Design a protein around this ligand. Structure first.
Ligand SMILES: [K+]
Ligand SMILES: [K+]
Ligand SMILES: [K+]
Ligand SMILES: [K+]
Ligand SMILES: [K+]
Ligand SMILES: [K+]
Ligand SMILES: [K+]
Ligand SMILES: [K+]
Ligand SMILES: [K+]
Ligand SMILES: [K+]
Ligand SMILES: [K+]
Ligand SMILES: [K+]
Ligand SMILES: [K+]
Ligand SMILES: [K+]
Ligand SMILES: [K+]
Ligand SMILES: [K+]
Ligand SMILES: [K+]
Ligand SMILES: [K+]
Ligand SMILES: [K+]
Ligand SMILES: [K+]
Ligand SMILES: [K+]
Ligand SMILES: [K+]
Ligand SMILES: [K+]
Ligand SMILES: [K+]
Ligand SMILES: [K+]
Ligand SMILES: [K+]
Ligand SMILES: [Mg+2]
Ligand SMILES: [Mg+2]
Ligand SMILES: [Mg+2]
Ligand SMILES: [Mg+2]
Ligand SMILES: [Mg+2]
Ligand SMILES: [Mg+2]
Ligand SMILES: [Mg+2]
Ligand SMILES: [Mg+2]
Ligand SMILES: [Mg+2]
Ligand SMILES: [Mg+2]
Ligand SMILES: [Mg+2]
Ligand SMILES: [Mg+2]
Ligand SMILES: [Mg+2]
Ligand SMILES: [Mg+2]
Ligand SMILES: [Mg+2]
Ligand SMILES: [Mg+2]
Ligand SMILES: [Mg+2]
Ligand SMILES: [Mg+2]
Ligand SMILES: [Mg+2]
Ligand SMILES: [Mg+2]
Ligand SMILES: [Mg+2]
Ligand SMILES: [Mg+2]
Ligand SMILES: [Mg+2]
Ligand SMILES: [Mg+2]
Ligand SMILES: [Mg+2]
Ligand SMILES: [Mg+2]
Ligand SMILES: [Mg+2]
Ligand SMILES: [Mg+2]
Ligand SMILES: [Mg+2]
Ligand SMILES: [Mg+2]
Ligand SMILES: [Mg+2]
Ligand SMILES: [Mg+2]
Ligand SMILES: [Mg+2]
Ligand SMILES: [Mg+2]
Ligand SMILES: [Mg+2]
Ligand SMILES: [Mg+2]
Ligand SMILES: [Mg+2]
Ligand SMILES: [Mg+2]
Ligand SMILES: [Mg+2]
Ligand SMILES: [Mg+2]
Ligand SMILES: [Mg+2]
Ligand SMILES: [Mg+2]
Ligand SMILES: [Mg+2]
Ligand SMILES: [Mg+2]
Ligand SMILES: [Mg+2]
Ligand SMILES: [Mg+2]
Ligand SMILES: [Mg+2]
Ligand SMILES: [Mg+2]
Ligand SMILES: [Mg+2]
Lengths: 201, 64, 144, 117
RNA sequence: AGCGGCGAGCGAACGGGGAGCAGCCCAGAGCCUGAAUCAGUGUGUGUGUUAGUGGAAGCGUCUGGAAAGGCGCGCGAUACAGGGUGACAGCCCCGUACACAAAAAUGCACAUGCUGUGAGCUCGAUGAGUAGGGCGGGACACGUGGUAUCCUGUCUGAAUAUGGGGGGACCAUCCUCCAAGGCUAAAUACUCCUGACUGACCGAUAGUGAACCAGUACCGUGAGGGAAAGGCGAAAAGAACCCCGGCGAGGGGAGUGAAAAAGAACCUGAAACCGUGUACGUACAAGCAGUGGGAGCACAGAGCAAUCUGUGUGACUGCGUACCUUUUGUAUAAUGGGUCAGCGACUUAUAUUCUGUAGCAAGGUUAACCGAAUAGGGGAGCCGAAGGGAAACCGAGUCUUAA
C-alpha cells in the first residue's frame, strides 16, 4: 500500500494487512469498551448489617407487643440499617486476547486511512519548547484536534503540546485504540509508521 | 473457590470416550452362594450410567 | 468511526434477568421459584447427589480399581509431533525441550495419529506397530 | 450509582390520581384506593363496550314493537315480513324511522304485511 | 495423590515459573598479630523534612440586580491542575508550570576521626538423661490404619565419625545428610497517625452513630445502650419611622433588596390532612360508590341565524359484592394494610457447564512476574487433536476369555 506524505510529497510503502484491512466494528467495540473498563478505579464500599455500628440486642421481644418482629437494629429494612448487598471495592478490568487487541488496532488504522484522518509526514518538530510555536505550526497545517505520533519523543514538542488541550503527543509504542478513535486527526512520522508496522507485524 | 469433587463418586464412576460414565454393578460383594452363576457372570462386566442418573453423576464430578 | 458510533454485534449482549420487579416482567412476586418448599427459600436446596434419602447412586454402587502412579509419568506421542522436535532425533529429552511431553514424564509411546513425512530417528521410546510402519516408510529408524 | 426514586414515583402516582378525578372520598385523593378504583373502572368499561351493543339493540327492538303494534302487527311478524320482502334495513334505522317518519314506517309495515299475505 | 461414620466434608507433596538473595559464630590452643567486620561517639560533604520568594497575558459592546455569558477584536502558555469573585473567567484574585530560599533542629547516604570488637594460617575438637524404645495424648492433608516422620506427660535409654539420622510399615543394598549450641539483611504482614492525589463512591431517612458543641441529650445501679437536628441574601443592606394591641404575642404600612408568598417558624416548597370562595347536584331515598346510557343547569368558543362543540356538574336508568395473600375453592364473617411522603428484598467473588457473539484455529491461551507502560515481554502451565483396560500394558483399537 502507498501512503502519500504531506510535507515531502513522496510515497511510503506500508503493509496492506495493517493499513488496508476491513473495519471489524464488533471487535473494535469490544476492545474500546475493555479499555474504558481498564480505566475504572472501582473504589467504594457500603456497610452491611454486620458493619453498621450498633449492638446485637433484639430491639423488642419476639411476641406480645403487637409490633412486627425485630431482630437487629441493623436490618436493611430499617432506617439507619445496613445496605442489603453492600458494595466492596471491585476490579473492573477485562481480558483482551493479544490477537484481538492487535486486530482491533489494525482495523482502526485502516479505517483512519479510508476516512482520510491519517496524515503522514517526514518530520514533525518545533525549534523551542514554546506553546505558541506549535500552535502556529498546527494552524499552518490546518489542524486543531490532533494526535501526533513520533518515532522518538521530542521533549520540545511534548512541552509545547502540554497546554493545548485538543492536541496530544506520543511515541509509537504508546498508542492506544481510544485515542486513535477520539482525536479528529492523527499525524504520524514516517519513522513512527515503520515502528507501528513492525509492532503489529 | 474451586468446586470440590465428590470423592466418593470419583471412586465409583469413570468417564468414557463419548462422555458417558462406566460403573461397577451392584450385588457382587457377598451373599454369593445362593446366586446363580449366570446372574453373577452378567454382573461382572462394567456398565454405563443410565440417562436418568447422568445428571446426578455429572453434578458430583465437575472435573471428570 | 467515533466513540459514539460504535455498536456491539447483534446477539452479543443479552440483558440479565431481574427478578421481583412487577407483573409485566413475567418474573414478579415469586421470581420463578414457584410456591413454598425448601427450594423457594433463601439459601434453600439440597446438596449434590442427594436423592431424598434413598441410598444415592454414588453409594449404592461399589468402588472399583486403583490409581497407578506409573501412568502419571507415561505419555503418548503423535506422528505429527515427530517433526516438531529440534534436530531430527526424537527421545525423551528432545520431546521435553519441544514441550511435547511434561518435565516429569519417564516413559513415552509413539502412536499412529497424524502423519510423519520426514526421516526421524526414534531413540529410547516405545513405538506402536502402525507407528513403526509409518516412521520406517517415511524413511526413519527406531533404535531401542 | 445510587438511584433516588422520588421524581419517577411522583409521576406515576400523579397519573393514577388524575385518572381518579370525580371519584368519592379517598377514591380521588389516596393513591392506594384510587389505584383500585381506576382498575375497576377500566374493567367495567371493557365489559360495557360489549354491553352497549346489547342495550341499544334492545332499545331499538322495543321501539319497533311499539310502532308496529300502533300499525296493527307485532314485532316478530313485522321482522319476518320484512325478511320475506327482501328488505335489509336494520333495527337502528327502523327505530329511527319509527320515531321520526311515521308515514314511512307505516309504508314499511304495509310492505311486511303484503309479503306475509 | 490421599484422608474420610470412605458420610458430610478435609486436602498435600514432588517437580516447574517468579520476587528477593548472604552468610556466619561458640563448644580451643599455638603462630601471626590488632589486619576484615559490625556497634557507638564526633567531624565534614551532599540530599531531604520542619517557615518561605518570584511567578505570564483583556479590552469594547448587548442582556442583566450583578457578567466570568452573547457578539467583536487582542494577548500568555514548560502555566487551560484546582479554588474564588453579585450567572459559566487561561489573561480580576489565590494559585498552577517553572525557577529559587534556612539562623536553628533533625532523617538518610557517603567521607573522615576516636572507642569497643576482633582478621588470617596451623593443629585439634564436633552439643547425652540426648537419639531410640514402652505407655497416654497431640501435630503432620493423613481420623491407628499396613503408618513412616515430628512434639512430649510418664517409665527408660545408646552409638558417639571404625559412628549416627533419613529415603512413608519392615529388611538388604545404594544414595544422601550430620540432631541433641547459637546469630543473621531482603523479598512478606499491618495503619492509631501525617502529606499529596484519585474515584462510572454517598449527597442530610444517604454517607461515619455523629456534615450541626455526638459518643452529646437521653436511658440504665452498672457493664452498657444511644438519638434527632444542614441551606435568608451577592452583600445584613437583618426591616429607621408610623398605626392596632397589654410600653404584649401577632399584624398592617413604610423602607432595603433583583426578589420579602427570600423576614430570620427564612432556597425550592410535593403529598396526606384542614379551610374560604364560586358552578352544578343533593332532604320519598336502600348496598364496593363505578361503568354504559342520559335530561337539565352553568361556562368558554363558533356561527347571519338555526344552533354546534370543548369544560364542570350529573336528576333518572341497564350492569356491577374492594385489593393482596393463601387456597380445592374467598364479597367472604380467612390474612395484611389508618393515610401520605421517603427507604425497603435474587447480589458480589471465585470455580464449572450450556447458549449467543467475537478472535484465532489442529491448535488456542497465557499466570505470577518484568516493564514507566491497558503496549511489549513472560507459554511455567491449562484445555484440545486417542482410546481401551482395575492395572502392567497395548493402541485405531482395546478389554473380556484358553479362544
Ligand atoms: K496537551
Ligand atoms: K424457575
Ligand atoms: K386531598
Ligand atoms: K453422613
Ligand atoms: K484446601
Ligand atoms: K462581555
Ligand atoms: K478561574
Ligand atoms: K503415624
Ligand atoms: K525418651
Ligand atoms: K548412612
Ligand atoms: K448507632
Ligand atoms: K443516624
Ligand atoms: K424565594
Ligand atoms: K428549607
Ligand atoms: K408554607
Ligand atoms: K312512601
Ligand atoms: K351534560
Ligand atoms: K348507575
Ligand atoms: K396478605
Ligand atoms: K394460609
Ligand atoms: K387454609
Ligand atoms: K381469624
Ligand atoms: K399475611
Ligand atoms: K457462566
Ligand atoms: K464462547
Ligand atoms: K484379546
Ligand atoms: Mg447507613
Ligand atoms: Mg500481556
Ligand atoms: Mg469380592
Ligand atoms: Mg408466569
Ligand atoms: Mg408466598
Ligand atoms: Mg404446597
Ligand atoms: Mg417448589
Ligand atoms: Mg437465611
Ligand atoms: Mg511445558
Ligand atoms: Mg446521586
Ligand atoms: Mg385533590
Ligand atoms: Mg516421591
Ligand atoms: Mg500571577
Ligand atoms: Mg444594562
Ligand atoms: Mg465585562
Ligand atoms: Mg443566581
Ligand atoms: Mg458561581
Ligand atoms: Mg553435631
Ligand atoms: Mg522420644
Ligand atoms: Mg517408633
Ligand atoms: Mg508413641
Ligand atoms: Mg496421636
Ligand atoms: Mg528421629
Ligand atoms: Mg526409617
Ligand atoms: Mg514423606
Ligand atoms: Mg528434637
Ligand atoms: Mg503505607
Ligand atoms: Mg491518610
Ligand atoms: Mg445521618
Ligand atoms: Mg432535602
Ligand atoms: Mg412587632
Ligand atoms: Mg417565590
Ligand atoms: Mg440561590
Ligand atoms: Mg420557603
Ligand atoms: Mg397541596
Ligand atoms: Mg330540589
Ligand atoms: Mg327529592
Ligand atoms: Mg344508605
Ligand atoms: Mg357516557
Ligand atoms: Mg345492581
Ligand atoms: Mg345484579
Ligand atoms: Mg381450607
Ligand atoms: Mg365469588
Ligand atoms: Mg363486613
Ligand atoms: Mg377480610
Ligand atoms: Mg396466617
Ligand atoms: Mg389489620
Ligand atoms: Mg440467582
Ligand atoms: Mg488414554
Amino acid at each position: 500500500m502507498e501512503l502519500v506524505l504531506k510535507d515531502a510529497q513522496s510515497a511510503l510503502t506500508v503493509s496492506e494487512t495493517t493499513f488496508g484491512r476491513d473495519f471489524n466494528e464488533a471487535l473494535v467495540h469490544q476492545v474500546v469498551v475493555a479499555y474504558a473498563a481498564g480505566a475504572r478505579q472501582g473504589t467504594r464500599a457500603q456497610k452491611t448489617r454486620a458493619e453498621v455500628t450498633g449492638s446485637g440486642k433484639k430491639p423488642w421481644r419476639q411476641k406480645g407487643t403487637g409490633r412486627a418482629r425485630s431482630g437487629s437494629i441493623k436490618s436493611p429494612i430499617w432506617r439507619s440499617g445496613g445496605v442489603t448487598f453492600a458494595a466492596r471495592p471491585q476490579d473492573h478490568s477485562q481480558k483482551v486476547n493479544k490477537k484481538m487487541y492487535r486486530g482491533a488496532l489494525k482495523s482502526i488504522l485502516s479505517e483512519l486511512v479510508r476516512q482520510d484522518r491519517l496524515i503522514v509526514v517526514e518530520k514533525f518538530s518545533v525549534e523551542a519548547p514554546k506553546t505558541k510555536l506549535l500552535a502556529q505550526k498546527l494552524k499552518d497545517m490546518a489542524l486543531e484536534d490532533v494526535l501526533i505520533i513520533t518515532g522518538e519523543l521530542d521533549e520540545n514538542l511534548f512541552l509545547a503540546a502540554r497546554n493545548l488541550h485538543k492536541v496530544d503527543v506520543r511515541d509509537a509504542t504508546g498508542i492506544d485504540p481510544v485515542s486513535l478513535i477520539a482525536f479528529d486527526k492523527v499525524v504520524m512520522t514516517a519513522d513512527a509508521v515503520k515502528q507501528v508496522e513492525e509492532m503489529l507485524a | 473457590p474451586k468446586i470440590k469433587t465428590v470423592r466418593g463418586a470419583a471412586k465409583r464412576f469413570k468417564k468414557t470416550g463419548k462422555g458417558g460414565f462406566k460403573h461397577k454393578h451392584a450385588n457382587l460383594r457377598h451373599i454369593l452362594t445362593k446366586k446363580a452363576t449366570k446372574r453373577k457372570r452378567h454382573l461382572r462386566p462394567k456398565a454405563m450410567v443410565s440417562k436418568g442418573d447422568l445428571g446426578l453423576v455429572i453434578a458430583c464430578l465437575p472435573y471428570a | 468511526m467515533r466513540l459514539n458510533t460504535l455498536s456491539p454485534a447483534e446477539g452479543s449482549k443479552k440483558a440479565g434477568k431481574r427478578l421481583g420487579r412487577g407483573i409485566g416482567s413475567g418474573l414478579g412476586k415469586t421470581g420463578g421459584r414457584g410456591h413454598k418448599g425448601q427450594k423457594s427459600r433463601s439459601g434453600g436446596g439440597v446438596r449434590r447427589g442427594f436423592e431424598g434419602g434413598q441410598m444415592p447412586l454414588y453409594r449404592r454402587l461399589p468402588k472399583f480399581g486403583f490409581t497407578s502412579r506409573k501412568a502419571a509419568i507415561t505419555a503418548e506421542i503423535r506422528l505429527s509431533d515427530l517433526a516438531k522436535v529440534e534436530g531430527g532425533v526424537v527421545d525423551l529429552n528432545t520431546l521435553k525441550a519441544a514441550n511435547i511431553i511434561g518435565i516429569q514424564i519417564e516413559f513415552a509411546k509413539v502412536i499412529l495419529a497424524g502423519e510423519v513425512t520426514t526421516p526421524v530417528t526414534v531413540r529410547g521410546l516405545r513405538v506402536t506397530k502402525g507407528a513403526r510402519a509409518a516412521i520406517e516408510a517415511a524413511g526413519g529408524k527406531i533404535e531401542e | 450509582a445510587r438511584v433516588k426514586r422520588g421524581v419517577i414515583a411522583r409521576a406515576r402516582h400523579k397519573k393514577i390520581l388524575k385518572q381518579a378525578k370525580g371519584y368519592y372520598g379517598a377514591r380521588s385523593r389516596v393513591y392506594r384506593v384510587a389505584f383500585q378504583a381506576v382498575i375497576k373502572a377500566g374493567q367495567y368499561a371493557y365489559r360495557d363496550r360489549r354491553q352497549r351493543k346489547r342495550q341499544f339493540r334492545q332499545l331499538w327492538i322495543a321501539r319497533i314493537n311499539a310502532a308496529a303494534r300502533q300499525n296493527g302487527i307485532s314485532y316478530s311478524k313485522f321482522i319476518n315480513g320484512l325478511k320475506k320482502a327482501s328488505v335489509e334495513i336494520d333495527r337502528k334505522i327502523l327505530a329511527d324511522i319509527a320515531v321520526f317518519d311515521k308515514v314511512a314506517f307505516t309504508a314499511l309495515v304495509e310492505k311486511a304485511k303484503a309479503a306475509l299475505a
